[PDB]
Each structure stands twice: as structure tokens, then as C-alpha cells.
Amino acid sequence: MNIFEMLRIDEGLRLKIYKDTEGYYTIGIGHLLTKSPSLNAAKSELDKAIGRNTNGVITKDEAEKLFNQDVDAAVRGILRNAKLKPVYDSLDAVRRAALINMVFQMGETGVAGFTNSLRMLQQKRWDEAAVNLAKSRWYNQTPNRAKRCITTFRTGTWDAYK
Ligand SMILES: [Cl-]
Ligand SMILES: [Cl-]
Numbered sequence: 001m002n003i004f005e006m007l008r009i010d011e012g013l014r015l016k017i018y019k020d021t022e023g024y025y026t027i028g029i030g031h032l033l034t035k036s037p038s039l040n041a042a043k044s045e046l047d048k049a050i051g052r053n054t055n056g057v058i059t060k061d062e063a064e065k066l067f068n069q070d071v072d073a074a075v076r077g078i079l080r081n082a083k084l085k086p087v088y089d090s091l092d093a094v095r096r097a098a099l100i101n102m103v104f105q106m107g108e109t110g111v112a113g114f115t116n117s118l119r120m121l122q123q124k125r126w127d128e129a130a131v132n133l134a135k136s137r138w139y140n141q142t143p144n145r146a147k148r149c150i151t152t153f154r155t156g157t158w159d160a161y162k
Contacts, residue, residue: 001158003071003097007104009161010145013063017042017056021142027056028063030104031070074100077108084111087118095121098152105145106138121153130154 011030017039020026025033025042033045043056050062078084078099088099099121102111112118114136120129130150133139139146151160 001161003100004067006097006158006161007067007071007101010101010105010148013060015058015060015063017046027058027066029067029070031063031066070104071100074103078103081108081112083115083118084108087122090122090124092156094156094158095153098149101149101152102138105142126154126156 008029013029014027017025017027020032024035025039027033027046033042046056047054049066050058078088088096091099114133117129117132120132130153133150148160
């Protein structure tokens with residue numbers, strides 16, 4: 001298991017524009033296109049992202065390419081963020097994956113806001129952080145995915161994904 005496989009399980013793969021759990025236009029492997037309520041606006045963001053007139057449909061290769069870019073950006077965002085970096089540096093490889101997953105789903109800003117949980121992870125208080133992470137809109141809105149990520153931070157293994 002690795003970050004790519006992990007996220008492919010959590011996000012799935014769709015080659016036509018779809019709406020995510022929050023109702024936002026998305027495509028591929030969880031690639032958010034726009035928060036705007038307009039399909040046209042989504043189609044336009046899509047074309048600009050792919051570099052061709054797509055008509056809301058992409059190939060598997062194109063989906064994976066957006067995916068590689070998105071994981072790279074998530075890592076880079078973590079490394080550039082003053083609150084996230086130190087946490088990431090302190091963690092083992094498996095738990096780092098869980099932090100990347102959260103950033104991919106919610107953005108750097110979103111994750112950076114889990115101040116208390118972050119401090120707990122940095123201190124390696126696994127059970128405490130898992131409880132704190134669960135007291136969030138994130139857990140309440142997407143509980144199964146949240147539980148998978150939390151179990152990962154709690155155990156340091158891939159058990160939730162196997
Ligand atoms: Cl893009
Ligand atoms: Cl979920």
C-alpha cells in the first residue's frame with residue numbers, strides 16, 4: 001500500500017464530470033474542478049486543466065496525470081506550511097500518508113486548522129489524537145473515510161485499507 005493506492009480507494013475513479021460529497025463538480029480521482037454551481041464553468045476549468053476541448057469526458061491516462069499532479073501539490077503544500085511541516089516531519093511513513101490524504105481532501109488551510117489534533121500527533125499521543133480528530137465536521141460528514149484515516153493515525157498500519 002502507498003499514498004496513491006490509498007487515495008484511489010478513498011476517491012474512486014470517474015471519467016465524466018461528477019459531483020462530490022459536498023455537491024461540487026469533480027472529475028477523475030477526486031480532482032475538484034470548481035465550487036461554482038455552473039456546469040459550464042466546470043467544463044471550462046476541465047478544458048484548461050487538460051489542455052484540450054474535452055466536453056466533460058477524459059481518458060484514464062488524463063485522470064492519472066491530474067492525480068499525480070494533485071498528490072505532488074498536496075505534499076508540497078504540507079512542506080510549505082508552517083503548521084503542517086513540523087508535524088509531517090515528526091511522523092513515520094504510514095502516518096505521513098494519512099496526513100497527505102487529509103490535505104488532499106480538505107486543503108492545507110483546512111488541515112492546518114486542526115490545531116489541537118496536530119499537536120497531539122506531534123507528541124505521538126495516538127489514541128488521544130484519534131478521539132480529537134473525530135470531533136469534527138469532517139468525521140460527521142464522511143465518517144467511513146474519516147475512520148479509515150483515523151485508524152491509520154492511531155495504528156500506524158494499513159489495516160483499514162486491507
Ligand atoms: Cl490543474
Ligand atoms: Cl465517507
